[PDB]
Design a binder for this molecule. Structure first.
Ligand SMILES: O[C@H]1[C@H](NCc2ccccc2)[C@H]2CO[C@H](O2)[C@@H]1Sc1ccccc1
Length: 330
């Protein structure tokens, strides 16, 4: 089997991407944030505190004839931005772009933090990291991809995120028309539960490539590219007026600037992120100071190849017995 679904930026800055997901019987369609950096499928629901729902589409398990409460199971998760959610668990039928999983753990939110409430465009998350990170207690549950894997034509899914444009998540197959050149595969460590890999280095604009090992995770659920302080300093040093701002919380730059591209290595291959991918607009409405899309990972503890990097590539998440990651230009 295979599945294929269109993924759409939630706003003009590509802050995140939502993908329609069918849940229950009859189908309830929610727009979820596919996140290769976590492993919980959770949703706004009829059980969510009313004051914490503001525009989201909710899952109502009482109206799904295939929904079953998972007895005694609860979940609770926190993300790097300090956001959080929690609740109970149902099993139900879940479909993504024609690919169906029965008995999928659907984590129903009772509580969500303010940042989720304030974002009316995201109805929940669909985790695509390794199931070892799933937070359901006392019995850990599997991801959508893990549940679907054996039935897929090939045990893979691919991410093709658009710059200011729609893109595609495919499951079970590789669309050879969706990229140029070849796909370069690179080793993955799953020891932290992530799609963790090692970039071979970087370049800034037309500058010479620096060969250096950068350990990081391919994470569709993070907006920006988070890299070592040395690398990030080297990038913004090429933007006149750019400065790291403590009050703002990272590198900002004059909105009138022309941003240089940023290249990262995948083995011997090179992925080029165009300069305008790195522009995340005014820090506040009307400001001429703009926020940078490449930031330091120093206060994170891990480098993150988030959407800024991934949307410059066609990315294969290969879930074979030994998983690997593939990158192609497009
Ligand atoms: O990019 C953010 C994500 N929010 C993206 C988003 C922004 C605006 C509107 C919708 C969605 C979530 C998931 O993880 C963090 O918060 C990461 S930044 C991070 C920091 C420390 C550790 C790991 C990641």
């Amino acid at each position: 089997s295979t599945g294929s679904a269109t993924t759409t930026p939630i706003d003009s800055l590509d802050d995140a991407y939502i993908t329609p997901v069918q849940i229950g019987t009859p189908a309830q369609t929610l727009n979820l944030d596919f996140d290769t950096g976590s492993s919980d499928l959770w949703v706004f629901s009829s059980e969510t505190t009313a004051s914490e729902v503001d525009g989201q589409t909710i899952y109502t398990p009482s109206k799904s004839t295939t929904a079953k409460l998972l007895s005694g199971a609860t979940w609770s998760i926190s993300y790097g931005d300090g956001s959080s959610s929690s609740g109970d668990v149902y099993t139900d039928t879940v479909s993504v772009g024609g690919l169906t999983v029965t008995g999928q753990a659907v984590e129903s939110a009772k509580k969500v933090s303010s940042s989720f409430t304030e974002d009316s465009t995201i109805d929940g998350l669909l985790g695509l990291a390794f199931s070892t990170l799933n937070t359901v207690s006392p019995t850990q549950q599997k991801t959508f991809f893990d549940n679907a894997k054996a039935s897929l034509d090939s045990p893979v899914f691919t991410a093709d995120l658009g710059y200011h444009a729609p893109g595609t998540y495919n499951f079970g197959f590789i669309d050879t028309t969706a990229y140029t050149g070849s796909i370069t595969y690179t080793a993955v460590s799953t020891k932290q539960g992530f799609w963790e890999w090692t970039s071979t280095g970087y370049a800034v604009g037309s500058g010479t490539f620096k060969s250096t090992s950068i350990d990081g995770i391919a994470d569709t659920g993070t907006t920006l590219l988070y890299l070592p302080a040395t690398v990030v300093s080297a990038y913004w040093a090429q933007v006149s007026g750019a400065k790291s701002s403590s009050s703002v919380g990272g590198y900002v730059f004059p909105c009138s600037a022309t941003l240089p591209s940023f290249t990262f290595g995948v083995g011997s291959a090179r992925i080029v992120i165009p300069g305008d991918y790195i522009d995340f607009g005014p820090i506040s409405t009307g400001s001429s100071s703009c926020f940078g899309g490449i930031q330091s990972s120093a206060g994170i503890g891990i480098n993150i190849f988030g959407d800024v990097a991934l949307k410059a590539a066609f990315v294969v998440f290969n879930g074979a017995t030994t998983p690997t990651l593939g990158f192609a230009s497009k």
